[PDB]
Amino acid sequence: ISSLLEKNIYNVHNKSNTLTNVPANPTGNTNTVWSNSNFTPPHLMYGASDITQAIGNISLTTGSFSLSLSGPWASPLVQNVAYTKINNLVNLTFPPFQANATSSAVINSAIGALPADLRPTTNIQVDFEIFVIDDGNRPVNPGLITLLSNGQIVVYKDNNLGQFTTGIGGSGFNPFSITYMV
Amino acid sequence: ISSLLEKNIYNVHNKSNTLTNVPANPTGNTNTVWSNSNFTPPHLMYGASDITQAIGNISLTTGSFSLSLSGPWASPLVQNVAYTKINNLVNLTFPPFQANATSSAVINSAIGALPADLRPTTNIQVDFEIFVIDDGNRPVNPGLITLLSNGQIVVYKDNNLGQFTTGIGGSGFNPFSITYMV
Amino acid sequence: SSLLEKNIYNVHNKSNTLTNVPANPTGNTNTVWSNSNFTPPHLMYGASDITQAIGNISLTTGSFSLSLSGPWASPLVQNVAYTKINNLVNLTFPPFQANATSSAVINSAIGALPADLRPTTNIQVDFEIFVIDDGNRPVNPGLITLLSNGQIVVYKDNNLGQFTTGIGGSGFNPFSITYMV
Lengths: 182, 182, 181
What we know:
Three copies of one chain form a homotrimer. Chain A has one helix at 51-57, and strands at residues 11-14, 16-19, 21-22, 32-36, 43-46, 49-50, 60-69, 77-86, 89-94, 97-101, 107-108, 125-130, 143-148, 153-156, 167-173, 176-181.
């Protein structure tokens, strides 16, 4: 045992290794593995590096969700919106939503459309300038997308609550992407 | 001792476990934990997997910093700006900064307001189109935020160095988010 | 036997080999073990799967040389910085500005974006950006479109606008765009 308490050449085998929960590195060395009792559950440490906290901080999910948008078009348009969430950071990448407009209206989803874990929580809405199209025209003013904390998505023709206009040629948007922390 | 040097059914307990810094996996096995002396400080290894390097390649931090902005308002507005940094990639998510304007001015921070590790270094400034408001109006032209390498943040009413304008209604911006590499 | 129950030993070893097992041998949140439900096995601390968390995120970063041309007398060549995390891409562009000797959009050749950064889910992805033309700072946004064939196009405005012959500089200050492929 005494030989294990100081440096040796032993390649130790064990079915498992249980590290006492302690508030500080017991040896002070950068190559000592220890278990940090300042957290519950405890954190695995390697020297001063907190492995458990680093692992928790690099959480990532990605995929898509179905989104139904409606307003100016004769019928709702349904497409899958791609997403990535890393820690608290979200990206949404939208495919095209475009069709002829039979009425004048903003584009919006139902309340709750954004998956719960992608909804803004620090802010009531988050706003982004995006390129939109109306009746086949490419307007020079930016459109505006607002993501709401209740999960509703609203897309305006311009920053001043602008509506898309009845007409043919395509109203809506080419693919775009927005990134934000919840 | 000899029983520890080959496979056993021991659930070993230790107050800590110090791994000799060595240049190669001493057993070659994918279930061997070791400490890699090819780096200083050393790297935690599991088999051929470099845990320290993998965590360092992500290098994620997140949180917020207090930001004081001033210009058109009677007094500075102070709010926390949320951030994520992943390797060289930064996200900033701003809460609302808006109040009545008693003078005509751009909005800016002090020099050094952006935390040092979020400041552009590859570029002298990085620019983003954002939706801004002035006197309660929602102008169709985008506002512009410029992040400067000296840590100053400037927000303009439009792309042409535009100033926010004296008046009641609210001047500044709804929440927005911008993403960039330093 | 003293090692098989709690002790105050700071143990040293040249390495530590953990038996591959399908479940935590002690049940405790401070036990390190090797999880045989995966190949290669996963390093565990309690119920925390260290190997899985690291394998779930894949980050690359660097830069690529980009040649843009159109309104300028000759192409401009600069490095564009990128990060890719799983399917998520950031591009951060340095300034591309010079005087314009013709009226034209700015574009790259086909295939200019590295293959692993090209949109595949969409044919193009569009972004509003601040551009400059003949030294003027126009209030209308410019537009960058990233195409699935790897071409990059930058327009003076959203309506296929071209940069304009003249002095003062045409192109853009640095900007950044982020998107999933």
